[PDB]
Each structure stands twice: as structure tokens, then as C-alpha cells.
């Protein structure tokens, strides 16, 4: 009887399906920084605020990095393979992951720009950190972003929507919809899309990007 009961446990159907009344529309996340809320404060780190000067942006860029690294956390941004849609022979993704505001990465090619993040081993991402500069890079500012998820390039699937209006700072996105029990994302394949820029732009930069995961002597 042990075989029969475990089979029910692996695949509960009558217990699981409540009404099967899903709305099936894609949920959209609001990123605006003019409204103060507890949920927004959790995802927006730098704080709600004329347009600051670029050096002020560089200063807040470092303070955002320090605050994100201040908490107990493990950075594995360099523990994965990256393959953007196309280069421009001026700046590879290294200057995007160099944690420097002055340097940045630029793609050049088709309008739906793609950024690939491949992982070697099953890593459980909890917080994804991305930095935007609306006033500094208004021409190449990312306006709409769609984040995918999957275990392979084969099974990439939609996760979340992100609309950009005015965000001149680091953006933190912890994942809770997928798994409420773990409060983290478990995947080996993450890809990002930038289908259109602000004011009908063509290309897109990426100032910063980071990935966050949880975990006498003789010299």
C-alpha cells in the first residue's frame, strides 16, 4: 500500500485544484520612486528623493553597493556564464559586472536585446540586484524589462514584468511569488529581455548587475 499512497503524495490532484480560475494575465511590478511604502522600501534600497549630478550618482552607486553587501549575503555574480545578444566591440559585459558606475556594457543589434545568465550548478538565487540611471543614460535607458526563469535554455518561462518610469538607483528584487515557503528562486537558467528603451530608444546600457544567494590557529 506504500506504493499507492506515495503516488498520491507526489501528484495530488483532487486536493490541489481548488477552482481552476486563474486570471492568466502577466503581473506587472511598479518601480516608481515617488511613493513611500513598506513593500517598495524592501525592493528599493537607495531611498526616495531636480536631477542629481553624475558624481552624486557615483556616490550613491557606491553607498548602494555597500548597503547591499552590508547584510549577511553571498555574491556569486562571477560564478556563472554570461552571453549577451550582441556586443558593440567597445564594452563587453565585464564592465557591467565590474561594480563601477563609470564603466558600463552596451549591446548593438536587434531591438529585442537579450542578456543570458547561465549557471553551472544548481544555485538558489534569493535577491537580484540591478542598477538603473534614468537621468544619466536617458537615451539608452531600459524602459521595459521581462525576466525569465528555467533550468535550461529549452524550458525558459516568464517570471515577472518590470516597467521603468524614473529609477536612478539600485533595484533589489527578491522572489516570493514562485515559492512562499523558501522565499527564494531556484533555477539554473536566467535570461533578460529589453524590448524597448525610453523615448523610443534603440540600444541599452547596463551600469551594474549583481546576483545574491544565501548559505587558535597557526598562520
Amino acid at each position: 500500500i506504500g506504493i499507492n499512497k506515495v503516488l498520491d503524495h507526489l501528484a495530488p490532484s483532487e486536493l490541489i485544484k481548488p477552482v481552476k480560475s486563474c486570471h492568466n494575465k502577466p503581473s506587472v511590478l511598479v518601480l516608481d520612486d515617488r511613493i513611500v511604502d513598506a513593500a517598495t522600501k524592501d525592493l528599493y534600497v537607495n531611498g526616495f528623493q531636480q536631477n542629481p549630478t553624475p558624481e552624486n550618482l557615483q556616490h550613491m552607486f557606491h553607498q548602494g553597493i555597500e548597503i547591499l553587501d552590508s547584510a549577511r549575503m553571498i555574491n556569486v555574480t562571477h560564478l556563472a556564464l554570461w552571453k549577451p545578444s550582441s556586443f558593440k566591440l567597445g564594452n563587453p559585459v565585464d564592465f557591467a559586472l565590474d561594480d563601477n558606475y563609470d564603466t558600463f556594457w552596451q549591446s548593438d543589434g536587434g531591438q529585442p536585446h537579450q542578456l543570458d545568465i547561465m549557471f553551472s550548478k544548481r544555485m538558489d538565487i534569493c535577491v537580484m540586484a540591478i542598477f538603473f540611471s534614468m537621468i544619466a543614460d536617458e537615451s539608452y535607458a531600459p524602459s521595459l524589462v521581462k525576466v525569465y526563469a528555467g533550468h535550461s535554455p529549452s524550458d525558459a518561462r516568464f517570471y515577472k514584468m518590470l516597467e521603468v518610469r524614473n529609477v536612478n538607483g539600485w533595484v533589489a528584487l527578491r522572489f516570493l511569488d514562485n515559492r512562499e515557503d523558501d522565499q527564494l528562486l531556484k533555477c539554473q537558467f536566467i535570461r533578460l529581455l529589453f524590448p524597448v528603451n525610453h523615448e523610443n530608444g534603440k540600444d541599452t546600457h547596463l551600469r551594474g548587475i549583481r546576483l545574491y544567494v544565501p548559505s587558535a590557529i597557526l598562520r
Binding site: 537615451s139 539608452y140 523610443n200 530608444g201 534603440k202 540600444d203
Partner: peptide, 6 residues
């Protein structure tokens, strides 16, 4: 400025 719109 580039990024010329149609």
C-alpha cells in the same frame, strides 16, 4: 544623439 525615430 542618434536613436533617430521613423
Amino acid at each position: 544623439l542618434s536613436d533617430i525615430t521613423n
